[PDB]
Subunit: 84 residues, 2 copies
């Protein structure tokens, strides 16, 4: 019934389970975004809501696009322009 | 192309609707980009110096989620009784 990521209502049905040894992707993406390793505790929620899943997928895509774009722009340059 | 390129996605950017990253009004965006990616982007004459509209929107949305997630972990910990909390 509660989302571990935004602490609001979920569904306990259409809310994916964060810790299900296969969406370790989600926990990885959360740590990459926030610098927090979320741990499975009995007294905390174990679910992510659909809205949080979607925004997380979007933020990861932008992060990867941004890193790859800095390498692509670097290659577009002449060897001289390459500095710092 | 430099004038019409997004520094964040390397694709076309509308000059007039692309905020200039390295100006005082936008220093928060360089920090948001570093929080998201781990990269501190730098102002060089030979690299684009604007963020396109599409990148600005997705970046704003990524920041909101980042902050909500950090604050949600605090709020769940306070939502516990002291005996529950002794766990973390
Ligand atoms: Zn949520
Ligand atoms: Zn862009």
């Amino acid at each position: 019934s509660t989302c571990r990521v935004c602490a609001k209502y979920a569904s306990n049905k259409r809310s994916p389970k964060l810790f299900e040894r296969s969406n370790t992707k989600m926990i990885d993406n959360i740590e990459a975004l926030t610098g927090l390793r979320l741990e499975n505790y009995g007294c905390l929620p174990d679910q992510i809501c659909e809205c949080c899943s979607m925004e997380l997928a979007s933020a990861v895509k932008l992060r990867e696009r941004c890193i790859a774009a800095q390498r692509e722009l670097l290659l577009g340059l002449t060897e001289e322009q390459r500095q710092g």
